[PDB]
Design a protein around this nucleic acid. Structure first.
Ligand SMILES: Nc1ncnc2c1ncn2[C@@H]1O[C@H](CSCC[C@H](N)C(=O)O)[C@@H](O)[C@H]1O
Ligand SMILES: [Zn+2]
Ligand SMILES: [Zn+2]
Ligand SMILES: [Zn+2]
Ligand SMILES: [Zn+2]
Ligand SMILES: [Zn+2]
Ligand SMILES: [Zn+2]
Ligand SMILES: [Zn+2]
Lengths: 96, 103, 311, 124, 78, 95, 113, 80, 93, 105
DNA sequence: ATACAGGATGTATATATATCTGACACGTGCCTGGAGACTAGGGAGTAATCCCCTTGGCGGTTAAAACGCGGGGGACAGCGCGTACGTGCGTTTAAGCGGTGCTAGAGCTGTCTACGACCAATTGAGCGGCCTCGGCACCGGGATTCTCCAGTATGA
DNA sequence: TCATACTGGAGAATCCCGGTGCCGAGGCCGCTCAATTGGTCGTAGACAGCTCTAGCACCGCTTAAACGCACGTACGCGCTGTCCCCCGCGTTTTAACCGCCAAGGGGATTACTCCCTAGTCTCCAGGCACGTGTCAGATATATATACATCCTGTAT
């Protein structure tokens, strides 16, 4: 039995080495269609556009989580909290 | 042609036509396309040199987007230039904070 | 005993040792040589205060001109100075010819504030300013109450010290000694020691009962008289300060008949009023009609004050 | 009933006879005679400078002036009350000297020197 | 729908970001932020497509929408 | 068909000039093309902003030099300026 | 030798100066500076610093007062925004006093290097 | 030379009071001076470049406005 | 020499919405700078759209799409309604 | 109606906007309806800003609008704050905001 | 003998109020950019057609998702403390207003030209389609290297 | 004599080597259309000259803020202790993806007309600077007010 924290670092290294998409295709596509249904119904999308949206969302979420980790380490703590994400989005200027 | 007259590889005619149809100004000078092509060629040469170094560092012959991401993020001037730019299939740098490391 | 409203300044082996021991105007009171403090000429006088005001220099006696031609925050700062700067001395005016009040000033030397009688600068940091209160100002917060001094009728222009004087009952309850407003007293045989004094009407706690008038004598005379007074087992001496002592035996007021009770109803204050050290007696608690007045003599040895036996 | 007594005279106080009297009034009576006999004692105080002082002292004792602002009203009262006697004894110019002194001591305004010599001489 | 982003998906996204320990109240906030971002970019793309008088959203529209938001993305012929 | 433009031939030629035994994939080629287009449009926008600020309707080599000095960091901008000056010299030598 | 005197001397004492508690003047100044809109940085020192910084790029340069005023306004606004973000970060740290690490984190999240 | 010390302690104190800071430490002045110097260097480099491109020897306000707009710090109140 | 501004029109709008209300010169310069900034943003957006659609003409449709993209929902909707009303009034006469 | 703005019922100059778009080098050819649309949008925007500024001035019992009123009107709105996020105003100031944690009990 | 509430007291402070002025509001002249009128011609709207790029449905299988236990390291409440910051005061020191002289640089104007736009021919450098293979992806197996548990020497 | 630190050792996810297979890329061939060349006409811009204007050194005086120092204090950090909540693992479920096969409709392409606007010549008043009158607000003094804070009375 491994101690807590070892598998976390191992997974960190594994996911930082590889570059595949952690989010699967169909659910993200269904979410995109549901979000686009509110603006206009009966719309069609290309697979390349869905893949590009997924890539952009994954990159944005990775950057936001890295900033949240920086904020949590600066807060003399280890566990991240929603207030860390809120402060990160406030300092970045993405929140009024 | 004209690229041979300057000892460059980028097309000067293509750039001049893009500047004409680019609606950037009324008239276009003659020395501007050569200058722009030289600057772009130097930039891409620097990027390709760093990518080739990273590929030789990874024992590979063909450059993958991961090598481009590593070469851009490892440099300072390229990181300052491409700050708001994301690369598909690029990845992140292997960075781990010190507080998360065990004893 | 003579009645007094103000103090009066005056300049076998037991017998053997007693014999061995033998080997113009007062601005402060506004009178002439008090007992508390130790046409040509017409024109010459008028010029000293009018300075060539012929219109008046003549009306008070051309002619005058002919004879002339012929003859030819801050308050807080002071508090800090007090902090920066139980023996008590008597106040005396200070005079600096060519300097302000400094460490060499007699006032600060004796550790006392400058009063309106001091000829020092108007804004002398050693001058004690009045209180800016709005009411009786009888609480510790009042600088005039904290400093036992009574409010001044010319500085404390808010609490009412400068108000009408006929109605002795005035807003500021820190001027009783100034007016001398004391309650009516009655002399009768004390149930404690010989004679005694009772209050006619009721009073409330911390209410000025009355002043303890008495002659002011030097410090050596204090002991000189106290020796024989102790030999009598009866003494009215009361140390006023390092400079003088109060002796009301020969002359004083009715309050002199007050006795002592370690659990008394009245207490004494050595208050500095108008630059004069005076003893006042206040109600240590609510007192009713007919009650007798007592206060702690604060003696260190019960030579004769140990009878007790009074409820 | 407790029985009370007078302080000067230890006779008992009758229930109708009381006639309330503090007998500890603002100024005692013996003091007034004391002051009169003490002023006269002064050698080198020309006859006039002896009477006006006695009159003034008696006046302030009678009214009990405490404050400086009273001294203008005080010099006015001293003529309202003692001016007739000042004229009888020919102390007018010594009273003027007194007024000048009182002004020097910063007690009275200068308009009261004139206003006082005016009031005194207006009834001459 | 919005629940298609499962808990292990957000867990892996946090492992990629360097998070060691995650609380149980982060998934809702992450889902909300992702929904806001997707709504914004989809509105932009739909506007560009409606101006083109077309009914299909291509990749160039998404590239333009990301470039306009200061999020220029490479790898699609932008 | 549509005759679209690209930069694959020139990028491949530069790569073979700086690295003969080195390949490249199509995704990296598209990335390089997008990067070249982004740098080109940024420099063109800077040149247009300078021409409009100076109330001049002509874009010469001086505007491009100032734009590349403003957009790139110190050492990179210095190297780019040296390369541009060498290219201008080689172009002005002949005609 | 000593007489049996009765004395009740109370030493007394003067009143202490009025002294505010720490933190009140800070809030008062915060309200005062949030009400007013004047330039907190004075003119002459900022101008001399600007001239020294511009001397390194090119010597013998002249500047207009309007340009210096605009630079001062922009710098003051940027510093105010940075200090506000630093205060937010310090508040998130369950503390009140700001530290240089807070400014470092603020500049890191903003992406400024 | 030494004009960097012109930003006195009370100036930064007032700037922090305006920003809402309640308590300030004694190690903030160096960091604030460094950040201000970096910002001034960036905007001054931009303005000097625009002025050199204008073939002039005096830096106007339009150049500073343009440099701030290029840095994403558009400022109003000076025209343009 | 001569130079352009927007003081007269801003003052007219102020007097139309507030007759008894003044304005200083600094606020006027600020409003002029804001108008120029909004104008240049919309013009740049229109040019980018024209280059993306391979068209060399800028009509009212491009401006409408640009104002829809640059402004938030309610503000953009109000601006679109105002622009359509103005275009109708201009095409009537 | 000689002025096209009167023909459209606006206050902003249509001729000046058309001249700026022609000399602006934004495109090759310019449409006829674009300047009227742009002038109407700009007029609506400035009218909203002036309405908020007038409200803030009436809220402060004043007759002349100061830049402080403009700063308050821009920062009090949500859409305008989102629009003018990276925009600074000279002599503007900040909003009187104080956090809850710094208040005592 | 404690702890909370209430009065009052000195200190900072919104508000009346009479003055002076310079920035704000308004009159006036004149010019050039905006308005009228008519024309060519090329960009744009629309009808028609192709197809390939998108959408829809079904079978399987298998890595990913989901649920529960337990647990140990992490989140969080509470007290000591001593040091760095807040507040106040004396000292002074550098900041700010009033004018002072003036000159190098910003700005407008007359003049010439050499560099850039427009156009006819053309051809070769650049682009669409094919094709083979080897650098790279996948998989099995063995050595490699870390990762945790327990015991022994050493401090106090 | 108990707590702690450091070394040895048994032991599981992971790295490297060899083999096999595969599809995107570099070379190739056919193609074609926009860069190149020679030539001419036009004007945006460089150049020199003159005029003016504000940026800068200069001093002198006044003065509020900067500086240093004393004294007090409260909280950031450290330490302790106490509860608990995601992580590692195991077992059960499940739908994403892959491969394949139909089907259609909107995007891309081509040809047609047509209308609106860039352009040119002519003429006028909206807006520009310029000048001038004028009161809203800055400035200064005093007063009522709000409030932080400290001592005292009260209930348990
Ligand atoms: N309660 C008491 N018992 C015995 N002696 C007392 C006393 N109270 C006061 N004395 C004495 O009286 C002197 C003070 S005079 C007090 C009043 C006086 N006994 C009278 O009846 O009029 C003191 O010297 C003291 O020794
Ligand atoms: Zn006397
Ligand atoms: Zn003295
Ligand atoms: Zn004195
Ligand atoms: Zn004195
Ligand atoms: Zn008082
Ligand atoms: Zn008093
Ligand atoms: Zn009083």
């Amino acid at each position: 039995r491994y101690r807590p924290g070892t598998v976390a670092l191992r997974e960190i290294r594994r996911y930082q080495k590889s570059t595949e998409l952690l989010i699967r295709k169909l659910p993200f596509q269904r979410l995109v269609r549901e979000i686009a249904q509110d603006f206009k119904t009966d719309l069609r999308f290309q697979s390349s556009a869905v893949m590009a949206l997924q890539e952009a969302s994954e990159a944005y979420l990775v950057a936001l989580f890295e900033d949240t980790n920086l904020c949590a380490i600066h807060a003399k703590r280890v566990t991240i909290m929603p207030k860390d994400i809120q402060l990160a989005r406030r300092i970045r200027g993405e929140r009024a | 042609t004209r690229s041979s007259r300057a000892g460059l590889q980028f097309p000067v005619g293509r750039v001049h036509r893009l500047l004409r149809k680019g609606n950037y100004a009324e008239r276009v000078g003659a020395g501007a396309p050569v200058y722009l092509a030289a600057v772009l060629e130097y930039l891409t040469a620097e990027i390709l040199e760093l990518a080739g170094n990273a590929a030789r560092d990874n024992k590979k012959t063909r450059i993958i987007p991961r090598h481009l991401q590593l070469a851009v993020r490892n440099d300072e001037e390229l990181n300052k230039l491409l700050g708001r730019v994301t690369i598909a299939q690029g990845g992140v740098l292997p960075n781990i904070q010190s507080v998360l490391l065990p004893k | 005993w003579s009645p007094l409203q103000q103090n009066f300044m005056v300049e076998g082996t037991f017998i053997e040792e007693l014999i061995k021991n033998y080997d113009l105007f007062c601005r402060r009171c506004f009178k002439y040589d008090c007992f508390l403090h130790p046409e040509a000429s017409m024109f010459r006088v008028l010029i000293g205060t009018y300075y060539d005001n012929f219109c008046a220099i003549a009306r008070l006696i051309r002619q005058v001109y002919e004879f002339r031609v012929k003859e030819s925050x801050x308050x807080x700062x002071x508090x800090x100075x007090x902090x920066x700067x139980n023996h008590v001395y008597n106040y005396q005016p200070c005079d600096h010819p060519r300097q302000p009040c400094d460490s060499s000033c007699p006032c600060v030397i004796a550790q006392n504030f400058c009063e309106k009688f001091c000829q020092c600068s108007s804004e002398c940091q050693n001058r004690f300013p009045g209180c800016r209160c709005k009411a009786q100002c009888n609480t510790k917060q009042c600088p005039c109450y904290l400093a036992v001094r009574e409010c001044d009728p010319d500085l404390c222009l808010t609490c009412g010290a400068a108000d009408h004087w006929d109605s002795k009952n005035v807003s500021c309850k820190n001027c009783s000694i100034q007016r001398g407003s004391k309650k009516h007293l009655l002399l009768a045989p004390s149930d404690v020691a010989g004679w005694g004094i009772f209050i006619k009407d009721p009073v409330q706690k911390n209410e000025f009962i009355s002043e303890y008038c008495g002659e002011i004598i030097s410090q050596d005379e204090a002991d000189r008289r106290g020796k024989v007074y102790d030999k009598y087992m009866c003494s009215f001496l009361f140390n006023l300060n390092n400079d003088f002592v109060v002796d009301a035996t020969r002359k004083g007021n009715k309050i002199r008949f007050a006795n002592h009770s370690v659990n008394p109803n009245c207490y004494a204050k050595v208050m500095m009023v108008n630059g004069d050290h005076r003893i006042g007696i206040f109600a240590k608690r609510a007192i009713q009609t007919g009650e007798e007045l007592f206060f702690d003599y604060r003696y260190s040895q019960a030579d004769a004050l140990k009878y007790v036996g009074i409820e | 009933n407790r029985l009370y007594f007078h302080s000067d005279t230890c006779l008992p106080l009758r229930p109708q006879e009381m006639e309330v009297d503090s007998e500890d009034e603002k100024d005692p009576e013996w003091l007034r005679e004391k002051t009169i006999t003490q002023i006269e004692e002064f050698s080198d105080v020309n006859e006039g400078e002896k009477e006006v002082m006695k009159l003034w002292n008696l006046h302030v004792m009678k009214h009990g002036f405490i404050a400086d602002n009273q001294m203008n009203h005080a010099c006015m009262l001293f003529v309202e009350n003692y001016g007739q006697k000042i004229i009888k004894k020919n102390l007018c110019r010594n009273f003027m000297l007194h007024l000048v002194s009182m002004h020097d001591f910063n007690l009275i305004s200068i308009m009261s020197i004139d206003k006082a010599v005016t009031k005194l001489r207006e009834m001459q | 729908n919005i629940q298609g982003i499962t808990k292990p998906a957000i867990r892996r996204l946090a492992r990629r970001g360097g998070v060691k320990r995650i609380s149980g109240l982060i998934y809702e906030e992450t889902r909300g932020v992702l929904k806001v971002f997707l709504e914004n970019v989809i509105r932009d793309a739909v506007t560009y497509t409606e101006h083109a008088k077309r009914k299909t959203v291509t990749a160039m529209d998404v590239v333009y929408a990301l470039k306009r938001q200061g999020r220029t993305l490479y790898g699609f012929g932008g | 068909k549509t005759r679209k433009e690209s930069y694959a031939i020139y990028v491949y030629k530069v790569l073979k000039q700086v690295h003969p035994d080195t390949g490249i994939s199509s995704k990296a080629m598209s990335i390089m093309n997008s990067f070249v287009n982004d740098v080109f449009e940024r420099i063109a926008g800077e040149a247009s902003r300078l021409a409009h600020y100076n109330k001049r309707s002509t874009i010469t080599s001086r505007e491009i030099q100032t734009a590349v000095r403003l957009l790139l960091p110190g050492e990179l901008a210095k190297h780019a300026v040296s390369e541009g000056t060498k290219a201008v010299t080689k172009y002005t030598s002949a005609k």
